[PDB]
């Protein structure tokens, strides 16, 4: 009467959520080529030199983050997470990062900017100290993951949630700010698709992190919260300097800072933690950008 036991298939749920994330991720599949970009040519031409500079640099910072999330972050987390369906979701998310998201920025650059300006902005990412610091910190945690060591994995998942749900947002602000004013709307459409993806990526990785956290003693949990909050504050302080560096020339630094604090709270919530920053009024233009 006994049966022969199941061989890792697709009808069997590994958990309560992976299948629905799998379906959501694959149904959200897109390519930048679906969006024609020549319609932004005039609203781009009309921006001040300061505005164009900030815009290029903002997207370049995003490109760097997605490059490392696709090359390193998502594949390494996929390697250490158990279960073929969980791995399939993480592999799909990894593909989106570098094959779709990172590439879309080049589609935008190639439309709006001459080659020399494109070359210069990629040189600028290499030498920018805030962008290098944030990459160093995030990638360092990814590369510190030890096989069968759930704590090192948790730390990298916190880093990934902070990249998905917090760090992208100093960059996302500006395309959204323009979209909300009816400017650069084709580029803005691409960015909204990227943002829609990152929101579900941050939730999913957050749920995996909570799984590991929930296995710990109360004492260990207290240390993990310390790690998460210390890391958030360290990233936050660096992001403030990055934000000022980019946005002071367009007069928006204070507004962007409010936006990144808002999203920091969302990252904490994705990790099952209470909000850390007090609520503030976000620019309604950016809210219309959503």
Question: Between 106 and 210, whose beta carbon lies closer to a second copy?
Answer: 106
Cα gap 134→80, rounded to integer Å:
23
Q: Is 66 annotated as a binding residue?
A: yes
Reading the block at residue 113, the tokens are 């900017």
Cα gap 7→22, rounded to integer Å:
20
Reading the block at residue 105, the tokens are 């920025």
Q: Is 97 annotated as a binding residue?
A: yes
Alpha helices in 2-149 (DSSP H): 18-27, 41-45, 49-68, 74-80, 84-95, 102-112, 115-127, 129-143
Residue 79 near a second copy by CB under 8 A: yes
Which residue in 22, 9, 116, 122 sits closest to 62, CA to CA?
Answer: 122
- Residue 121's contacts (CB-CB under 8 Å, 6 or more residues apart) are 56, 57, 60, 109, 113
**Rounded least distance, CB 269 to a second copy, Å:** 27
Question: Between 53 and 198, whose beta carbon lies closer to Mn ion?
Answer: 198
Can you spell out the DSSP letters for 254-287? HHHHHHHHHHHHHHHHHTT----S---PPPHHHH
Cα gap 20→74, rounded to integer Å:
19
Binder of a second copy out of 67, 160, 165, 186 (CB under 8 A): 67
Q: Is 198 annotated as a binding residue?
A: yes
Question: Between 130 and 179, whose beta carbon lies closer to a second copy?
Answer: 130
201 binds, among a second copy, Mn ion, none (CB under 5 to 8 A by kind): Mn ion
**Rounded least distance, CB 97 to a second copy, Å:** 8
Which stretch, 97-105, 157-165, 219-227, 272-280, contacts a second copy (CB under 8 A)? 97-105
Residue 13 near a second copy by CB under 8 A: no
Cα gap 250→244, rounded to integer Å:
10
Residue 91 near a second copy by CB under 8 A: yes
Cα gap 1→198, rounded to integer Å:
47
136 binds, among Mn ion, a second copy, none (CB under 5 to 8 A by kind): a second copy
Cα gap 186→197, rounded to integer Å:
17
Binder of a second copy out of 37, 77, 112, 135 (CB under 8 A): 135
Which stretch, 39-47, 89-97, 169-177, 247-255, contacts a second copy (CB under 8 A)? 89-97
Which stretch, 135-143, 157-165, 200-208, 276-284, contacts a second copy (CB under 8 A)? 135-143
Q: Is 177 a catalytic residue?
A: no
Query: Total residues contacting a second copy (rule CB under 8 A)?
Result: 55
Reading the block at residue 130, the tokens are 């805030």
Q: Is 254 annotated as a binding residue?
A: no
- The residues assigned a catalytic role are 105
Contact residues for a second copy, defined by CB under 8 A: 3-11, 22, 26, 29, 31, 60, 63-64, 66-68, 70-71, 75, 78-79, 84, 87-89, 91-92, 94-95, 97-99, 102-103, 106-107, 109-110, 115-116, 118-120, 122-123, 125-126, 131-132, 135-136, 139
């Amino acid at each position: 009467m006994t049966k022969i036991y199941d061989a890792a298939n697709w009808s069997k749920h590994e958990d309560d959520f992976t299948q629905m994330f799998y379906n959501q991720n694959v149904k959200q599949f897109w390519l930048p080529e679906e969006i024609a970009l020549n319609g932004d040519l005039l609203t781009w031409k009309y921006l001040g030199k300061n505005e164009q500079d900030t815009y290029m640099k903002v997207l370049a910072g995003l490109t760097l983050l997605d490059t490392e999330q696709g090359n390193t972050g998502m594949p390494i987390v996929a390697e250490h997470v158990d279960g073929h369906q969980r791995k399939a979701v993480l592999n799909f998310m990894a593909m989106m990062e570098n094959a779709v998201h990172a590439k879309s920025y080049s589609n935008i650059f190639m439309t709006l900017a001459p080659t020399e300006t494109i070359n210069e902005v990629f040189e600028w990412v290499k030498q920018n100290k805030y962008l290098q610091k944030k990459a160093q910190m995030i990638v360092g945690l990814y590369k510190a993951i030890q096989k069968d060591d759930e704590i090192s994995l948790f730390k990298a998942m916190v880093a990934s949630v902070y990249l998905e749900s917090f760090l992208f947002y100093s960059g996302f602000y500006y395309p959204l700010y323009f979209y909300g004013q009816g400017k650069l709307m084709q580029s803005g459409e691409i960015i909204n698709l990227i943002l829609r993806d990152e929101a579900i990526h941050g939730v999913y990785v957050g749920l995996l992190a909570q799984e590991i956290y929930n296995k710990q003693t109360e004492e260990k949990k207290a240390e993990l919260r310390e790690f998460a909050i210390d890391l958030l504050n360290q990233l936050y302080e660096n992001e403030l300097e990055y934000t000022e560096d980019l946005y002071d020339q367009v007069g928006l630094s204070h507004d962007v800072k409010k936006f990144i604090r808002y999203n920091a709270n969302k990252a904490l919530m994705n990790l099952g933690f209470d909000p850390y920053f007090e609520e503030e009024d976000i620019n309604p233009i950016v809210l219309n950008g959503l």
